[PDB]
Design an enzyme around this catalytic site. Sequence first.
Site, mmCIF file in Angstrom:
data_model
loop_
_atom_site.group_PDB
_atom_site.id
_atom_site.type_symbol
_atom_site.label_atom_id
_atom_site.label_comp_id
_atom_site.label_asym_id
_atom_site.label_seq_id
_atom_site.Cartn_x
_atom_site.Cartn_y
_atom_site.Cartn_z
ATOM 1 N N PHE B 140 -13.784 20.465 11.396
ATOM 2 C CA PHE B 140 -13.353 20.183 10.100
ATOM 3 C C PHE B 140 -11.724 20.427 9.850
ATOM 4 O O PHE B 140 -11.227 21.370 10.543
ATOM 5 C CB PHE B 140 -14.170 20.868 8.976
ATOM 6 C CG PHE B 140 -15.572 20.796 8.900
ATOM 7 C CD1 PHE B 140 -15.984 19.706 7.981
ATOM 8 C CD2 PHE B 140 -16.460 21.532 9.766
ATOM 9 C CE1 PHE B 140 -17.513 19.133 8.083
ATOM 10 C CE2 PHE B 140 -17.732 21.130 9.551
ATOM 11 C CZ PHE B 140 -18.114 20.077 8.873
ATOM 12 N N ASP B 199 -20.067 9.305 0.045
ATOM 13 C CA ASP B 199 -20.889 10.218 -0.582
ATOM 14 C C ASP B 199 -21.255 9.960 -1.991
ATOM 15 O O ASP B 199 -20.604 9.875 -2.684
ATOM 16 C CB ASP B 199 -20.372 11.752 -0.492
ATOM 17 C CG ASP B 199 -21.473 12.862 -1.104
ATOM 18 O OD1 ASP B 199 -22.407 12.631 -1.663
ATOM 19 O OD2 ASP B 199 -21.008 14.197 -0.881
ATOM 20 N N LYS B 228 -30.455 12.528 -5.217
ATOM 21 C CA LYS B 228 -30.658 12.879 -6.576
ATOM 22 C C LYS B 228 -31.571 11.792 -7.217
ATOM 23 O O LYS B 228 -32.778 12.027 -7.326
ATOM 24 C CB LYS B 228 -29.272 12.898 -7.223
ATOM 25 C CG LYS B 228 -28.375 14.069 -6.859
ATOM 26 C CD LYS B 228 -29.098 15.719 -7.054
ATOM 27 C CE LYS B 228 -28.102 16.611 -7.373
ATOM 28 N NZ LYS B 228 -26.876 16.550 -6.351
#
Lengths: 378, 377
Positions: B140, B199, B228
């Site tokens: 990362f 995302d 979701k």
Amino acid sequence: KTPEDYINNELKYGAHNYDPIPVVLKRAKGVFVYDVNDKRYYDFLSAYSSVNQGHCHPNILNAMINQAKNLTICSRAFFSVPLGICERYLTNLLGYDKVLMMNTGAEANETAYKLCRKWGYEVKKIPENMAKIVVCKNNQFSKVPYDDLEALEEELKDPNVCAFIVEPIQGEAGVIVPSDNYLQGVYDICKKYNVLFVADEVQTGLGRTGKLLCVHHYNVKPDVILLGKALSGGHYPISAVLANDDIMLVIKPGEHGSTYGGNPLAASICVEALNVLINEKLCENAEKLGGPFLENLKRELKDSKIVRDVRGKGLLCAIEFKNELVNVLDICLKLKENGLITRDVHDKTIRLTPPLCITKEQLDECTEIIVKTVKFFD
Amino acid sequence: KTPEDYINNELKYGAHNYDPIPVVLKRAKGVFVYDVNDKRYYDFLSAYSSVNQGHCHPNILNAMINQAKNLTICSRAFFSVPLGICERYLTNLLGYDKVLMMNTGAEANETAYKLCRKWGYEVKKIPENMAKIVVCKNNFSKVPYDDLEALEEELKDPNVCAFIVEPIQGEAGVIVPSDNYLQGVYDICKKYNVLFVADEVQTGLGRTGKLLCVHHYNVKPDVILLGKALSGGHYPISAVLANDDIMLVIKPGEHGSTYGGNPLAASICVEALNVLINEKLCENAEKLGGPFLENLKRELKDSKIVRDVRGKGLLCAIEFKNELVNVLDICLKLKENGLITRDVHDKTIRLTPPLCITKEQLDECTEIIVKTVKFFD
């Protein structure tokens, strides 16, 4: 369509992260599942204990419907009625001050890791970054062999050990049952060195070995318990961590997220799923039927060339084969042909893990299915 | 049993991992929730977009009931009928070859990290364990959001396998980026052969007016993360979508949760998306979104505590001058006036109602919000 059509449609549209046994299921009830050809099988996996109560228990569906008609999720930005009902119910049932509800087994594990280290820092006064968790081989970390008190005591001498986490019977390793006196040893050593004793009962709990907690067999009380799977009777991913206030109160708001943990729908399902377990006395059933079932299998497979061991406790059982003498995936495939579905671990061991509402009579039939199948490969 | 009764009961028997707004909810329908005192509130959080379709949508309940009567879980040791139906439904809807179904947004993130890195090694041929994922700050190695120039400097690095970005930063305060940020992300990722991962767990599925927020900009990412509203709040469900050239790097062997891809989730998920499409909730959000945000901008134009009013479709926020107001207090006052949300970073209030909200309801809410802001003015 056909079984192959469904399988191929999954190969086309879905990631190839699993290599399943090629049975295509469409229905299930109790101990049985039904494929697209209307063939019936005894389920000897129980979805890894999620369906301890049997597949599609109507009383659990009804709690799910009654709650889902009113409220399914609002997020932890607000409170919902059903969560505290569940927390009170679970903590009273298991005898811990507090519970922390989550969704998956991995979430319960990570939550336990964090709880353990924060207790390590805040209460044990371990210097920052140094909190070590000890875990068993084939389960800052360290590993010890399973069922080994000498090795355990050697690790816990280190003042920076905050916790030891151990399953009362190792599942992934191939249903490994420790000696009697192991868990009393664990309890004693962890107490000696002021180390949290965490029992992982995600698989072994909730009737599977014949008790609410497999730990109950040994009259031992862990500092922390991890639960999941059967918590929901397979209707919802639900998991939990329980501990008394001296441990749990170390947790404070702010944390991270995972919006579905503690949701009202899971909370209502959970209370009913355990209501079913207790009311139908499935713990007692597994405890009554499991011992005889296993002794029978030992008996009937004793002096089978390809069998190495037969082992279990309650309805958590397994047969270990000699994988140099048979292909165990082929045993599994033949089991399926003969009306019984399961999976192996480590190309050696077959899980024998039926729902807990199974009958003595059904277990006799399954013994015959299994024995016929092992004979085929001798 | 009073609100306080329920709150203290959770404090006694539950871990203190959260500090919620003290409203105790017992019922919800569409745009509304109801507390233990039978008070009605507009839900302006939508369980962080899980209930885009509205709370307790009867069609989703019906699909849940219809599946659960038959089969809820068997584990991925075997196949189930509903999963492949859901996978074909999802992939055909969004235009990707393959999907990987899971339970939580964090499961989708971790799966995406592992997919990105293995693609990196097997396709891009990045050297032994050098694969680097780039993300944005406040989401990362890290890079500033909406910064087309610093993105290029990082991806130059041949070890970078992916850049993962939300079309609108939610947790940072609903940071709407400039147009041609997303177009220029695509171009740079295509330039250096880095997976462009969008995302859309918060932004997707109708919230910003489109099926994917990235559709506003006619950009096609290499990987999509969804979650979701995939379930209508009935089940934790998430997904990673990618074309075969990327997705095929995943081999059998790794285990996650036995619940990923279960039949009950799979059948709930097809109906949740069906409700979304058939009720034209994406269209409702695009339509009602613009005008609603028009008003708020102009109705609070001379409010001295209001710093900014922003968003897209029904993904909106008002940001406050922190030095001047306690934003948690505004949230509690909002509650008093019959609208519930949360804030972020102690300065920005989410304004994210379910997508089935009506023009007349959103007018009511604009008055509620303006009234409340003026109390602190």
